[PDB]
Design a protein around this ligand. Structure first.
Ligand SMILES: *[C@H](C)[C@H]1/C(=C/c2[nH]c(/C=C3N=C(/C=C4\NC(=O)C(CC)=C4C)C(C)=C\3CCC(=O)O)c(CCC(=O)O)c2C)NC(=O)[C@@H]1C
Ligand SMILES: *[C@H](C)[C@H]1/C(=C/c2[nH]c(/C=C3N=C(/C=C4\NC(=O)C(CC)=C4C)C(C)=C\3CCC(=O)O)c(CCC(=O)O)c2C)NC(=O)[C@@H]1C
Ligand SMILES: *[C@H](C)[C@H]1/C(=C/c2[nH]c(/C=C3N=C(/C=C4\NC(=O)C(CC)=C4C)C(C)=C\3CCC(=O)O)c(CCC(=O)O)c2C)NC(=O)[C@@H]1C
Ligand SMILES: *[C@H](C)[C@H]1/C(=C/c2[nH]c(/C=C3N=C(/C=C4\NC(=O)C(CC)=C4C)C(C)=C\3CCC(=O)O)c(CCC(=O)O)c2C)NC(=O)[C@@H]1C
Ligand SMILES: *[C@H](C)[C@H]1/C(=C/c2[nH]c(/C=C3N=C(/C=C4\NC(=O)C(CC)=C4C)C(C)=C\3CCC(=O)O)c(CCC(=O)O)c2C)NC(=O)[C@@H]1C
Ligand SMILES: *[C@H](C)[C@H]1/C(=C/c2[nH]c(/C=C3N=C(/C=C4\NC(=O)C(CC)=C4C)C(C)=C\3CCC(=O)O)c(CCC(=O)O)c2C)NC(=O)[C@@H]1C
Ligand SMILES: *[C@H](C)[C@H]1/C(=C/c2[nH]c(/C=C3N=C(/C=C4\NC(=O)C(CC)=C4C)C(C)=C\3CCC(=O)O)c(CCC(=O)O)c2C)NC(=O)[C@@H]1C
Ligand SMILES: *[C@H](C)[C@H]1/C(=C/c2[nH]c(/C=C3N=C(/C=C4\NC(=O)C(CC)=C4C)C(C)=C\3CCC(=O)O)c(CCC(=O)O)c2C)NC(=O)[C@@H]1C
Ligand SMILES: *[C@H](C)[C@H]1/C(=C/c2[nH]c(/C=C3N=C(/C=C4\NC(=O)C(CC)=C4C)C(C)=C\3CCC(=O)O)c(CCC(=O)O)c2C)NC(=O)[C@@H]1C
Ligand SMILES: *[C@H](C)[C@H]1/C(=C/c2[nH]c(/C=C3N=C(/C=C4\NC(=O)C(CC)=C4C)C(C)=C\3CCC(=O)O)c(CCC(=O)O)c2C)NC(=O)[C@@H]1C
Ligand SMILES: *[C@H](C)[C@H]1/C(=C/c2[nH]c(/C=C3N=C(/C=C4\NC(=O)C(CC)=C4C)C(C)=C\3CCC(=O)O)c(CCC(=O)O)c2C)NC(=O)[C@@H]1C
Ligand SMILES: *[C@H](C)[C@H]1/C(=C/c2[nH]c(/C=C3N=C(/C=C4\NC(=O)C(CC)=C4C)C(C)=C\3CCC(=O)O)c(CCC(=O)O)c2C)NC(=O)[C@@H]1C
Lengths: 73, 118, 172, 273, 162, 162, 172, 172, 172
């Protein structure tokens, strides 16, 4: 997801992260085994440095792994 | 119920018809304080039409003061105080005033059948 | 975030030194201008609605197609966006103007703006145009107010311009 | 307690009164010291409007003090219908959502995030809304923005106590009502050191939020249906946190922010700390 | 970084509204005060060194054992460090005066203070003394509002340290 | 309600930190300004009436048709209302000067402005004129900072109305 | 949710039986009226804005104080709410009218409503009044439309009334 | 929220009137004291850590049991809480002091505090005690500062007290 | 119940100590003021009827609606209550004033008052207003009596105020 401007209102250095997506991370609200999105199997997000560590750790315990990390600017 | 009837009634016979079932209902339920149960009695037509009509104003005052509380009336003035009420306010208030009086509350105030502590 | 003061600090920090006396004198004088600085901002904020309204009229008189079916400003929905956007940009610019620094503007606002516009199919050119239109109107007020002590605001006026322009450029 | 009749024989508006009982008010008929029965530590009386004055004076003249008075009509009203919240609905923002589908999510979010509470047009946030519908922000990220927004702080966190704010937060971010004293504690500690922002972040970050409506699903009321690791008492708490539909979390009303969940109830479910 | 000016912008920004009168009033405050603030900074900057010497020293008087062998205060390296460190604290303080906000302090000094100190077994106490001694000296070179400002910031650290 | 003082408290509160120097600076600003603000309020309060008359009037000159039968400006009730309303606007403005924040304005006037106006078919335009005419008059009785303040607030509404 | 049909079902279910023939004939007839029913709804929705606008005017002419400082409809903010509320109630009423059942109205709308109003200090009496004001105006349209085939709508009209009234009562 | 100024406004609003000249003169004078007001606050914030530390020591010297096994301040975990709490209360008090109004304190800090304490089994009495202990120490600083222009702060001192006391009372 | 003396005792009790000499001197001086204290009370009681009468008139001149059909003070029955209430509050206030302590007032009178008012739908705001109206009138007498030895009663006057205010606040 291309950042339109700095996403986050609270301010710090922002770093784009691209993740392969587990079904669990973005379960669809559907009967039977949940399925992550068809279009995005690689959700890309802009995160503040402070939140970076939490985001990454949550990503890590979920099945999906960081494809790449890029600074957001 | 058995006791309540006796103490507030003359000890006069009470027929099953006479007994008010709606007040008796609610005791099992809760939601009626026993002092409030006793209020329902006497607010009853049963007591007013009989034990109130026949006797003179003075008579029922003494008999209330007996039925609701053991004491007979200590002084002329306090009997007079209720007599002021007769016209001053509705009868229901005056009887309500007795159970609302302090000593009714002080002894056997709540959750207690009145007794002839006299 | 950042602003004029903080900035100078940061620089000093990396050298590992106390602020040079010379450098203080930048800030000392900056303070003196405050009053001027403030009024400038006040003027913008006071006229905000208008500035935009105005700029828009002119924008649409020029590029008729934007408002025609198939254009980018059509229909209502889109139009609305376009107005909102202009405003935003303005808002930021103001912020900067107060801070005495581009940063805030660049970071929160301008960064990624171009790309957005591109992805949407919004014509970046026209956006830029609008920004300028705004610029001129805005300056108009900054520079011609009522009840203010008469004096020279040029210094501030130009800095204002620059901000507008950084905007224009990075969008374009 | 349930009150059986709304009006008395002679027309009057019956009012429940709750008092902390005192030994003088009620006393057993026993030798030794007068003691009010234990079960009636809190005592509820139902009285016509007329006697109220005299009834309360007496209660207060004695060691009794009045916990609360409520009109009997409001009381002895059903527990709120759970119709709408029994099955919440669910709102999913698909990638490449149509202009209408984006609008639906926004409206749904504002509902659950801010409770019934009404959001004026001025109050509503254009920038955040703008980002969704171009892509770039998850529904989850929109949620974050809203909690961080002053609107939310002014309503929930700034008026009421942080004990209030935590459950208020639980409900908004998760359907669930708080289970156990521990959760309330934990959040307060987090607030002290980390500050507001980190506490807000924790809820959205938490796996429970991820496990149900993790991303791009507006939050819906998980409470009012059985959930994993949820104490039965929590379900009952939900009824206290959620009153009806058209009932909102309001800083506006008289003594507006108070606790829906009494602290003892929390302690019942779990204690240890 | 947290200064008056940055905050009002932030608050304005969050709501999504222009800077109105409310905020400007606030800003004005910062600017009026600055004159005093600035003065204070010039005074500290000049006497820096002398303040540092005095402080370091003090600490040792206060905690003699530090200078004994096998301790932290012992051996020049450590003394050098001790000096350096205090310099820093001072440096930042000046910064903060000028910036008109705690910002500079927060981000350099305060954030992560604890853990650093824990892992290297630096006792906050020490620093504190340094500061206090300083505060006392500063309480001569300055006066009136300039002084008041100096204090505020110095303290702010004491509180953060403790 | 948004005033300088309330906000800094709020911000302090959110972060969970004591009021430090940063905020006080801001507060100070509000207080220094007040003297001018207060003056302005005394001036408006006194001439209230006259301003109101003049405004109401103006509106009618600007929009003659309003006074024709079957219109909104027509029949005393409406005129009374029109007067009342403007009084209000003024009243609040004074308030805001004194409170040192837009707060009072926001909560009474602004929030929900649109819908009210829509449902009763009040054209913002009208109010605006009222204000403008006012602004012009105020631009005589006042001067310097007092004036400047008056303007700010008056405008703030113009912008909110439009 | 619930409505006329579903309702009858549910009842039948608890008895454990197929639908009684008698009961079918309630629904059979209900169907026949549909067309009428629908138009009724259509009339409300069509005039919505007005219904409210109107009712309000009258509400405020009566209870001047509501709009005076210290009243509940003052200031603007509050006013807005009050308008919004009226609308909502209306919205629901309509819904019900279609369903052929009070439920939806009771459950979504009236549930908790009184208590809210109480807590706020909103005077329930006045609210109720407004509801009625609305009622009358609404009926006005339902009952006097244009271009519709002429017939008797009374049956529907009365049911409409009842809904309004349930509202009035439970609020009050 | 609320503070001294806003408050007076609100009152005036309900009367429906412009501010009384008399009333202005309350605010006018309030302004004059600002400087004093501020320093007071500054003093608290400056000494914060200490105030607490101090109060605690004294609290625990008095009520030995709190720190004994089975008491409420034991073990560590609990102790921590108790400290944290004190702080909070303080924080708020300060806030109030600046505002020139109890409100802020009452709403976020005090309201429901008692009940919490009760539910937990924390002894309300002791809490109250601590609050006072704090009070005295705090005043100590407010009233004896260094480098401040000497004058009369009593007025402020007493108001400070009151805040502490509202706290003490509502907890107790 | 409680009052100034009793109170100090109680405090002392929990410490487990005799009264401090310092503390005695609070009470010793309190005694000295008695005479003043008394007259204050006497003044209120003497003028009671009036105080109320007066306050009411003003209350109803302000909030016309209260006395209009649909208002809270209408009809007679209600009106009566409202008058009675005012009186009561006054009565208590007096009590307090004599005692030299808020308690009596809080406990017997103020406790639960708000909630009552709420349940009834009585507008708490207006009640509070009335309380103040009373306050001012009352002070009027306290402070301007006839045949009393001339001296300073301020101390008492202020304490009086406070009582009124606790009332106003807890109702509101
Ligand atoms: C069956 C004919 C063949 C097959 C299917 C299969 N799929 C998965 C896993 C996934 N398949 C999808 C498909 C979709 N993504 C979408 O968003 C949509 C709708 C728009 C669809 C239909 C996705 C996303 C997944 C990944 C997550 C999931 O659990 O579904 C599997 C299992 C793969 C695994 O390792 O778990 C299978 C078997 N693949 C075959 O082998 C069949 C020939
Ligand atoms: C108006 C002068 C011109 C114009 C505007 C326009 N914008 C969009 C869409 C968007 N523009 C923005 C703007 C921003 N991105 C940011 O990051 C910020 C600051 C935080 C702003 C102000 C964004 C995010 C979008 C996309 C979503 C939206 O609803 O705005 C459009 C519509 C494009 C679409 O199809 O969505 C338009 C028309 N473009 C023109 O044609 C004008 C010359
Ligand atoms: C510049 C574009 C135009 C201009 C500005 C100008 N302003 C001043 C002086 C002041 N302006 C203000 C205004 C504010 N100070 C504040 O604190 C706030 C926020 C509440 C505002 C809006 C103030 C107080 C002053 C000082 C007193 C005064 O008004 O004169 C000057 C004078 C020089 C200076 O630097 O102070 C000037 C020149 N005047 C122009 O001619 C430009 C069109
Ligand atoms: C003693 C081991 C501990 C203790 C007891 C204690 N209790 C009270 C007061 C009351 N306790 C009761 C309990 C009862 N009343 C009943 O009727 C019954 C059973 C039918 C019980 C068990 C009640 C009701 C009271 C309050 C009123 C009353 O005394 O009747 C106190 C004193 C509290 C007071 O202020 O009166 C005490 C001390 N507390 C201790 O110190 C021990 C740990
Ligand atoms: C003076 C009171 C004591 C002293 C100083 C001393 N410091 C260290 C180690 C460190 N000191 C710091 C401090 C800072 N470094 C920074 O970058 C900043 C922020 C701008 C500060 C204030 C740090 C980070 C360290 C840790 C490791 C390092 O510096 O590389 C020591 C060494 C302790 C050790 O065990 O290594 C010493 C001795 N000397 C004394 O005598 C006092 C105890
Ligand atoms: C004057 C320029 C014009 C005018 C105005 C007018 N207004 C209304 C009705 C309302 N106007 C408002 C405005 C306010 N009322 C408030 O309480 C506030 C905040 C303090 C504002 C800004 C509102 C809310 C109403 C609706 C309710 C009401 O009765 O006030 C009318 C009456 C129209 C109607 O009754 O439908 C009029 C005429 N009158 C003129 O002649 C000018 C064109
Ligand atoms: C208008 C007829 C009268 C009036 C109403 C009024 N209501 C509020 C506030 C609220 N009212 C509601 C009602 C609803 N919320 C819902 O979602 C629904 C049904 C689904 C309804 C009908 C709620 C929840 C609120 C709280 C949120 C809010 O404040 O908007 C007010 C505002 C309270 C205040 O005092 O500020 C008002 C005024 N009051 C009148 O004066 C009219 C007689
Ligand atoms: C009743 C309140 C008033 C009224 C209504 C009325 N309508 C009809 C008949 C029809 N009306 C419709 C309208 C619709 N059918 C739909 O499917 C929809 C939504 C898409 C609408 C709005 C239709 C199709 C009919 C049938 C054909 C026709 O118009 O004749 C009647 C006649 C009775 C009947 O159809 O059984 C009536 C009475 N007319 C009045 O006089 C009332 C004021
Ligand atoms: C210290 C003087 C005394 C003491 C305090 C104490 N408190 C707790 C636990 C809690 N304290 C609170 C209170 C607050 N939350 C807030 O937001 C505010 C301001 C509005 C306060 C004051 C809360 C919520 C808790 C419960 C959860 C938590 O611990 O965070 C304890 C711990 C007891 C327990 O088991 O929870 C203690 C000890 N107790 C003493 O012994 C002192 C007399
Ligand atoms: C009261 C407890 C103590 C006290 C205070 C006192 N202060 C002044 C005067 C000033 N105090 C300040 C302080 C500030 N002003 C600000 O803007 C800020 C925030 C950055 C602060 C901290 C200022 C600037 C003044 C004016 C100049 C001066 O210092 O005198 C006085 C003087 C009387 C007056 O202001 O009218 C007093 C008395 N004095 C005491 O008795 C206590 C020590
Ligand atoms: C008069 C200033 C305002 C007013 C008052 C009002 N009160 C009632 C009814 C009651 N008010 C009370 C009063 C008290 N209860 C207590 O415990 C005490 C202290 C001992 C007081 C002051 C109570 C209990 C009642 C209910 C029973 C009663 O008979 O009073 C009403 C009437 C309520 C009704 O629905 O009729 C009123 C009107 N309301 C106003 O209009 C004034 C603003
Ligand atoms: C204070 C509000 C006003 C005021 C009072 C004032 N009173 C006295 C002295 C006395 N007042 C009394 C009155 C009483 N004492 C009682 O025992 C009783 C009940 C029967 C009353 C009503 C008494 C006995 C005294 C002592 C002798 C005397 O009357 O002078 C003073 C003098 C100072 C003192 O403290 O005694 C004063 C000032 N005077 C004012 O100016 C206020 C308006």
């Amino acid at each position: 997801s291309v950042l339109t401007g700095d996403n986050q209102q609270r301010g710090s250095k922002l770093f784009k992260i691209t993740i392969a997506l587990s079904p669990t991370l973005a379960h669809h609200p559907w009967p039977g085994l949940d399925t992550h999105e068809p279009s995005q199997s690689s959700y890309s997000t802009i995160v503040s440095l402070e939140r970076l560590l939490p985001e990454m750790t949550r990503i890590k315990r979920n099945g999906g792994r960081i494809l790449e990390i890029t600074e957001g600017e | 119920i058995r006791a309540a009837y006796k103490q507030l009634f003359g000890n006069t016979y009470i027929l099953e018809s006479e007994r008010v079932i709606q007040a008796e209902s609610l005791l099992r339920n809760g939601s009626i304080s026993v002092r409030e149960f006793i209020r329902i009695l006497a607010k009853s037509d049963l007591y007013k039409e009989r034990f109130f009509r026949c006797t003179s104003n003075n008579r029922f005052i003494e008999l209330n003061l007996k039925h609701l509380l053991g004491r007979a009336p200590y002084n002329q003035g306090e009997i007079a105080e209720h007599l002021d009420r007769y016209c001053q306010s509705g009868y229901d208030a005056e009887i309500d005033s007795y159970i609302d009086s302090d000593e009714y509350r002080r002894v056997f105030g709540e959750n207690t059948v009145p007794y002839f502590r006299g | 975030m950042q602003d004029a003061f903080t900035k100078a600090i940061v620089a000093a920090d990396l050298r590992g030194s106390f602020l040079s006396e010379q450098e203080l004198n930048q800030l000392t004088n900056l303070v003196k201008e405050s009053n001027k600085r403030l009024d400038a901002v006040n003027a913008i904020t006071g006229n905000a609605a208008e500035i935009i309204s105005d700029a828009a009229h002119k924008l649409f008189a020029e590029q008729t197609d934007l408002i025609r079916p198939g254009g980018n400003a059509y229909p209502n929905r889109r139009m609305a966006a376009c107005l909102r956007d202009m405003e935003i940009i303005l808002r930021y610019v103001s912020y900067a103007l107060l801070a005495g620094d581009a940063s805030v503007l660049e970071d929160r606002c301008l960064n990624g703006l171009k790309e957005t516009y591109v992805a949407l199919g919004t014509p970046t050119r026209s956006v830029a145009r609008a920004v300028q239109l705004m610029k001129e109107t805005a300056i108009g007020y900054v520079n011609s107010p009522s009840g203010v002590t008469r004096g020279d605001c040029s210094a501030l006026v130009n800095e204002a311009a620059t901000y507008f322009d950084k905007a224009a450029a990075s969008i374009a | 307690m349930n009150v059986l009749t709304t009006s008395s024989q002679r027309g009057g508006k019956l009012f429940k009164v709750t008092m902390t009982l005192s030994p003088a008010l009620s006393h057993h008929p026993w030798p030794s010291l007068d003691t009010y029965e234990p079960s009636q530590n809190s005592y509820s009386v139902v009285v016509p409007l007329d006697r109220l004055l005299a009834e309360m004076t007496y209660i207060k003249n004695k060691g009794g003090r009045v916990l609360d008075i409520s009109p009997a009509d409001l009381e002895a009203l059903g527990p709120p219908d759970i119709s709408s919240v029994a099955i919440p609905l669910k709102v999913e923002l698909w990638a490449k959502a149509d202009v209408s589908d984006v609008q639906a999510a926004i409206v749904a979010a504002y509902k659950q995030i801010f409770g019934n509470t009404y959001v004026l047009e001025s109050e509503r946030l254009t920038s955040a809304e703008s980002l969704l519908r171009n892509g770039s922000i998850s529904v989850r990220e929109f949620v974050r923005l809203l909690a961080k927004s002053e609107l939310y702080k002014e309503r929930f966190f700034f008026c009421t106590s942080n004990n209030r704010f935590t459950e208020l937060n639980f409900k908004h971010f998760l359907g669930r009502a708080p289970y156990n004293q521990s959760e309330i504690a934990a959040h307060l500690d987090r607030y002290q050191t980390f500050g507001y922002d980190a506490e807000i972040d924790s809820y959205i970050d938490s796996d429970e939020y991820i496990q149900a409506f993790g991303e791009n699903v507006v939050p819906y009321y998980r409470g009012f249906k059985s959930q994993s690791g949820q104490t039965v008492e929590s379900f009952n708490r939900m009824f206290k946190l959620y009153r009806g539909d058209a009932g909102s979390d309001t800083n506006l009303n008289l003594q507006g922010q108070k606790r829906r969940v009494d602290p003892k109830n929390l302690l019942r479910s779990g204690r240890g700390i | 970084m947290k200064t008056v000016i940055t905050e009002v912008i932030a608050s304005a920004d969050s709501q999504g509204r222009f800077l109105n009168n409310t905020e400007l009033q606030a800003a004005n405050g910062r600017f009026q005060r600055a004159t005093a603030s600035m003065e204070a900074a010039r005074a500290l900057t000049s006497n820096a060194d002398s303040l540092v010497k005095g402080a370091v020293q003090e600490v040792y008087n206060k905690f003699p054992y530090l200078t004994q062998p096998g301790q932290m205060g012992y051996g020049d390296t450590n003394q050098a460090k001790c000096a350096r460190d205090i310099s820093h604290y001072l440096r930042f303080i000046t910064y903060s005066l000028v910036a008109g906000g705690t910002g500079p302090l927060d981000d350099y000094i305060v954030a992560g203070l604890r853990e650093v100190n824990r892992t290297f077994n630096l006792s906050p106490s020490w620093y504190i003394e340094a500061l206090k001694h300083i505060k006392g000296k500063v309480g001569s070179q300055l006066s009136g509002q300039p002084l008041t400002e100096a204090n505020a910031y110095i303290d702010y650290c004491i509180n953060a340290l403790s």
